[PDB]
């Protein structure tokens, strides 16, 4: 009997695990502690991921440039919310479960969300630790 917000947590650990793998999950964890997202970017046809990915499907070819993605750039994409909490009391700020992205870089990060948070509003990363928080103002 797992509520949402359990339920959202674990998604969201399953895909650290599985972005973790290879040399380019190690710079993308890497960059976060250091504050920065990091992607990478495909020699062949140019595209940004995000995070970091060490293959390109779309090229069929090995990715080894790393890039840093200007995080004063993430808006929100897409996302759902959550208006109480897995006992069923009402919260004061609803929680966002949002999909991040940036312009021109292929993927996104799934993330937590609070604020005035509305399709394509700019978001301000709050905390570096997986799964990612960011504010809508
Ligand atoms: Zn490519």
Not at 56 to 76: L, P, Q, R, S
């Amino acid at each position: 009997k797992e509520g949402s917000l359990l339920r959202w947590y674990d998604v969201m650990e399953a895909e650290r695990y599985e972005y973790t793998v290879g040399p380019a999950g190690e710079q993308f964890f890497n960059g976060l502690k250091q504050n920065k997202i990091i992607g990478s970017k495909c020699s062949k046809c140019g595209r940004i991921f995000v995070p970091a990915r060490s293959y390109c499907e779309h090229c069929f070819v090995k990715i080894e440039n790393y890039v840093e993605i200007n995080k004063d750039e993430a808006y929100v994409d897409s996302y759902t919310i959550i208006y109480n909490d897995d006992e069923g009391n009402k919260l004061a700020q609803p929680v966002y479960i949002a999909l991040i992205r940036f312009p021109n870089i292929e993927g996104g990060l799934l993330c937590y969300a609070e604020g005035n948070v509305k399709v394509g509003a700019k978001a301000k990363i709050l905390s570096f630790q997986w799964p990612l928080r960011v504010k809508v103002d």
